[PDB]
RNA sequence: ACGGAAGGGCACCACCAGGAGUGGAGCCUGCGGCUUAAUUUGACUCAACACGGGGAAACUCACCAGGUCCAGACACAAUAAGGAUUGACAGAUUGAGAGCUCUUUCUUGAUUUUGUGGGUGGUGGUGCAUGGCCGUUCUUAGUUGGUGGAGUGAUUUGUCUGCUUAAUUGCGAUAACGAACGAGACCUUAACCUACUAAAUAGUGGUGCUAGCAUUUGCUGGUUAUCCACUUCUUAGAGGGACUAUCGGUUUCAAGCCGAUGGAAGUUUGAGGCAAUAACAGGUCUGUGAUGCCCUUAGACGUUCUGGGCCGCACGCGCGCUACACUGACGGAGCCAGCGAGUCUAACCUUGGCCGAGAGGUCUUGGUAAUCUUGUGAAACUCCGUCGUGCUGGGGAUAGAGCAUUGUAAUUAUUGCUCUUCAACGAGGAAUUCCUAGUAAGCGCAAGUCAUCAGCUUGCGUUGAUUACGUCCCUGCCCUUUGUACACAC
């Protein structure tokens, strides 16, 4: 009934908002990303991630209640939604996941140089072409500064960075 | 039967392999058609500032959403119709059919 | 954010809070007789034979019809 | 906070039925979807339930999402006088 | 009291607000999403809006 | 790093050359100061001042006069169903049927309330504690590692004399070798395709139906169910195409440079996007339920209600619009675009036709869109006339009266229409801005804000010039050499 313009953008913000939800709540579960596939009478949400049974819950208790929550939120009907999960291979090739793991290491209280050396070691032995991480803020100090850790070559300009790099 | 199928997407190559398997299905089942009526593409433009606050120099960014729309008018009996509908559901692309 | 004398006059006057009065529900006191009713209750069909019509001064107040039963009997 | 036990236990039976809740962060509305009680009453009941810690919570674009726990479901089970494993809102 | 929110908000900037941060300036009504330009600039590519020129 | 030191190369945020201008008048709008109850505030060279998407009636809103409400969770103890507590009509009260509060007796009854901590809220402070984002240094070409070599070492070479390039781009030269980032590459758009895919949501022609004139054959037209065919225009898709091709000079004769021909296109084809290392004690805690620390937290700096306010004017600055008239104003005619947005559980765009001078009103219609608004019949323009060089039919602030619309509310007139009043201003001073091609400039147009309000901005197209093809003289940039009592670094 509504225009396809606002249809599409509502689908876009729909994706964005549920992505915000899921990178919030499934953050400690090795989240990476999600994908609705539209269907007649149905719509489906894989979650590319690592800790699969953890996001499921017992007999999928967690995913069931998540379906109920998101459905009640978006005023969908029951049965309109199905969720799945995907133990993605090459865990190192997911900037979001590696950053989240780094975050939990930090909150645990791990040495940050140690952590970053370890993370980029893990990436480049997972078999990337170039890795990069960076910190900025208060760091064993009272004044702002940064650090950096990297190896291999990278790029900064072009459709190459629009496509190849994960950020 | 006089249906009109249409697609309203942005993912170009997705839409196009969709249209290709669509049309070859239609022609191998030997059903009448028109071609893929390719509408003019519509670019949704949003032009605003990069800067969240007010200061710094003035600098404008223009984000784009490129929309491609296609449609064909068809005739075919109900069984081939519904098989065509329940097949060729490729994700990312938006679809709808009408009749009369 | 330091200059505020509250030059308005002193008016911290939180209203009465349903003051703890004595017993209520004085239907009547009929010793050796059937206890009849005082504070003739409102004729609202909502009323369940225990809503005392207030009557402050020649004006009746229903509490079931929480502001509306005005008569002069 | 002053709320009728009517509305509080309406929310409770809603919870034990469903297993999840969502609320838009709009006071002055006083009309929760799916529950004819007040938006604010819902949200503040949930605030209390969180402060005692029988429910987990998130904002996520200002729609106040809440989800139940095991202490929560057994608490509601005995609150509403149900048997063990009566009918939680997280069935198979 | 029933006049706790007496004033009308049938139009204007008190009516509109962002769906992300409930802010009342920088709002982007175009195409009906009503987000601040800041958050929108943060969310554009994951939406699908993108830079070409 | 700096240099009123040198050498070379560079840029219209730099000059010459010129074009239009600004500063001169008026007016819109921002900053300052001043006033005031408040006239919240942030930002102050470039790199703050039509910037905060900031076109404020209310809201926003952060400010002022004031009136409320509590959303003070959780834990401890307490009050306490002989009632913890909530609410109340009518009068008084108060702008205020805010019981806000009081008179008052009623309604309700474990939800509260009381106090102790304890958490929250905060457009409250700190942007010099932060992140993130942005801007800028910096649109320029520059930045770095490994291994070797020099040096006790800071460090250096690699990263270069020279030549060339928009370019540390290349030729090459060479205690350096080999690599990476940046640039280029790449992406988008603009242009070419009578070649492929095609199509009443785009057109073309023809057929039939049909109007006029000519009638002679025809010309100009209307006709979605009259159909037939095509896709040049129209779209989009895949693709091709220019790479400096060729030619001629010039050049160690190498990179490459100039010219000419051809070519849609021969300044990296044009314009953008993307856009490195290091850095600022740049801006922003007022975009962020991101925020540390502090402050506040119930006669709250929280929230809400009313009325003002952010515009207040003795004065100074910055953006822009109007003009200073014949290359014109006015009245008639002709009168051609493109970008782009649009109603669903709402009331957007609105066509038609009726009324009204007009604004506008009216009942209808179509549209979720190449489909209808719309061929947006835009303006400028062109053709005709009125005018006459006259602070004059230039120009239209300034004011008055009336008429409609938006909105709960228009009062310091929202805005629009009509009549009347018709002031400075005769080309702008010291100074200063932008600019080399469809660019400037003129022209209007949509979108953003948005209930209504453009003199704002972002984009669109329409008409369309002169003046250079250079230099470092000013202002600054890049490399190298040199000097230095410089390092929060002239
Ligand atoms: Zn009654
Ligand atoms: Zn926002």
Quickly give B39 CA vs F337 C1' distance in Å: 22
Domain edges within chain B: 1-100
Alpha-carbon span E32 to E46, nearest angstrom: 17
> Token match 């191998």: residue?
B28
DSSP D44: H
Which nucleotide across the nucleic acid strands is nearest to E20, CA versus C1'? F288
Supply E29's token pair.
């009504």
Alpha-carbon span B76 to B2, nearest angstrom: 8
D23 contacts D34 by C-beta, under 8 angstroms:
no
Closest residue to D67, CB basis, from A20, A24, A65: A65
Q: How far is CA C68 from CA B83, C25, C26, C44, C64, in A?
A: 68, 20, 21, 10, 9
| Collapsed DSSP state (helix, strand, coil) of residue E16 | coil
Instruction: Return the beta strands (E) in chain D as ranges.
Output: 20-21, 55-58, 65-68
Q: Which nucleotides of F are covered by protein (CB under 7 A)?
A: 42-43, 47-49, 51-54, 58-61, 65-75, 80-90, 98-113, 123-124, 129-136, 180-189, 197-201, 235-238, 271-279, 281-290, 295, 299-301, 304-306, 340-345, 368-370, 407-408, 447-452, 458-459
Strands B37-38 and A86-87: unpaired
Residue D20 near chain A (CB below 8 Å): yes
Judge whether residue C26 contacts strand F, using its CB and a 7 Å cut-off: yes
Instruction: Identify the CATH homologous superfamily for domain A4-84.
Output: K homology (KH) domain (3.30.300.20)
Supply B12's token pair.
């170009």
Quickly give D40 CA vs F384 C1' distance in Å: 75
**Minimal CA–CA distance to B10: which of B68, B90, B63?**
B68
D38 contacts D80 by C-beta, under 8 angstroms:
no
| Angle made by CA atoms A122, A125, A127, in degrees to the nearest 5 | 120
| All chains having 3 or more CB pairs closer than 8 angstroms to chain A | B, D, E
A41 contacts D70 by C-beta, under 8 angstroms:
no
Judge whether residue E17 contacts strand F, using its CB and a 7 Å cut-off: no
Alpha-carbon span D15 to C69, nearest angstrom: 40
Cα-flanking dihedrals φ and ψ of residue A72, to 5°? Answer: -65, -30
Alpha-carbon span B90 to B67, nearest angstrom: 17
Task: Give me the number of domains chain E comprises.
Answer: 1
Domain region containing E42: 1-53
Alpha-carbon span A142 to A140, nearest angstrom: 7
Quickly give E38 CA vs F248 C1' distance in Å: 60
Judge whether residue E50 contacts strand F, using its CB and a 7 Å cut-off: no
- The structure was resolved experimentally with cryo-EM
């Amino acid at each position: 009934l509504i225009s396809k313009k606002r249809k599409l953008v509502a689908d876009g913000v729909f994706y964005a908002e549920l992505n915000e939800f899921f990178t919030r709540e499934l953050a400690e579960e090795g989240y990476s990303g999600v994908e609705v596939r539209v269907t007649p009478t149905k719509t489906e949400v894989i979650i590319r991630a690592t800790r699969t049974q953890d996001v499921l819950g017992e007999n999928g208790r967690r995913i069931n209640e998540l379906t109920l929550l998101v459905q009640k939120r978006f005023k969908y009907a029951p049965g309109t939604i199905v969720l799945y999960a995907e133990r993605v291979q090459d865990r190192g090739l997911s900037a979001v996941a590696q950053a989240e793991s780094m975050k939990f290491k930090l909150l645990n209280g791990l040495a940050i140089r140690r952590a970053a050396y370890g993370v980029v070691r893990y990436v480049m032995e997972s078999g990337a072409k170039g890795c990069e991480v960076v910190v900025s803020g208060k760091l064993r100090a009272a004044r702002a500064k940064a650090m950096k850790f990297a190896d291999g070559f990278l790029i900064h300009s072009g459709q190459p960075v629009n496509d190849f790099i994960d950020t | 039967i006089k249906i009109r199928i249409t697609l309203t997407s942005t993912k170009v190559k997705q839409l196009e392999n969709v249209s290709s398997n669509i049309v070859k299905n239609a022609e191998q089942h030997n059903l009448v058609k028109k071609g893929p009526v390719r509408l003019p593409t519509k670019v949704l433009k949003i032009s605003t500032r990069k800067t969240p606050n007010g200061e710094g120099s003035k600098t404008w960014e223009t984000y784009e959403m490129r929309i491609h729309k296609r449609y064909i008018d068809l005739e075919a009996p109900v069984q081939i119709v519904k098989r065509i509908t329940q097949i060729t559901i490729e994700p990312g692309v938006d679809v709808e059919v009408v009749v009369a | 954010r330091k200059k505020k004398v509250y030059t308005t006059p002193k008016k911290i006057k939180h209203k009465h809070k349903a003051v703890k009065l004595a017993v209520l529900s004085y239907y009547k006191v009929d010793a050796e007789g059937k206890v009849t009713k005082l504070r003739r209750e409102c004729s609202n069909p909502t009323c369940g034979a225990g809503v005392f019509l207030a009557n402050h001064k020649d004006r009746l107040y229903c509490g079931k019809c929480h502001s509306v039963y005005k008569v002069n009997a | 906070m002053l709320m009728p036990k009517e509305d509080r236990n309406k929310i409770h039976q809603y919870l034990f039925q469903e297993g999840v809740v969502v609320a838009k962060k709009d006071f002055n509305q006083a009309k929760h979807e799916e529950i004819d009680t007040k938006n604010l009453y819902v949200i503040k009941a949930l605030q209390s339930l969180t402060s005692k810690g029988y429910v987990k919570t998130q904002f996520s674009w200002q729609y106040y999402y809440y989800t139940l726990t095991e202490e929560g479901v057994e608490y509601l089970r005995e609150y509403l006088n149900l048997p063990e494993h009566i009918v939680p809102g997280t069935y198979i | 009291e029933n006049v706790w929110f007496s004033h009308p908000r049938r139009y204007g900037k008190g009516s509109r607000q962002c769906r992300v941060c409930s802010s009342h300036t920088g709002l982007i009504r175009k195409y009906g999403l009503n987000i601040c330009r800041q958050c929108f600039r943060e969310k554009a590519n994951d939406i699908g809006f993108n830079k070409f020129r």
